[PDB]
């Protein structure tokens, strides 16, 4: 979560680490044209 600005800038490990910090989750991915971040 909170790890993907968009085309100008973006990160995978940044948002991936956040989703991992939470228990029960697994991974993450940039949603909404890689502009938004979500965890699952």
- The domain that holds 37 is classified in CATH as 3.30.30.10
Please count the other Cβ atoms lying within 10 Å of the Cβ belonging to residue 37: 22
Structural domain includes residue 4: no
Annotated binding site: 2-4, 12, 18, 29, 31, 33, 37-38
Pair of tokens at residue 22: 């939470």
Report d(CA 18, CA 33) in Å as an integer.
19
Pair of tokens at residue 5: 């600005």
Structural domain harbouring 34: 11-40
Please count the other Cβ atoms lying within 10 Å of the Cβ belonging to residue 33: 9
Structural domain includes residue 19: yes
Structural domain includes residue 6: no
Give the three-class secondary structure for 39.
Answer: strand
Structural domain includes residue 30: yes
Deposited experimental method: NMR
Report d(CA 37, CA 19) in Å as an integer.
10
CA 16 to chain centre: 5
Report d(CA 29, CA 12) in Å as an integer.
7
Structural domain includes residue 3: no
Domain count, the chain: 1
């Amino acid at each position: 979560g909170f790890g993907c600005n968009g085309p100008w800038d973006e990160d995978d490990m940044q948002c991936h680490n956040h989703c991992k910090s939470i228990k029960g989750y697994k991974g993450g991915y940039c949603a909404k044209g890689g502009f938004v971040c979500k965890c699952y």
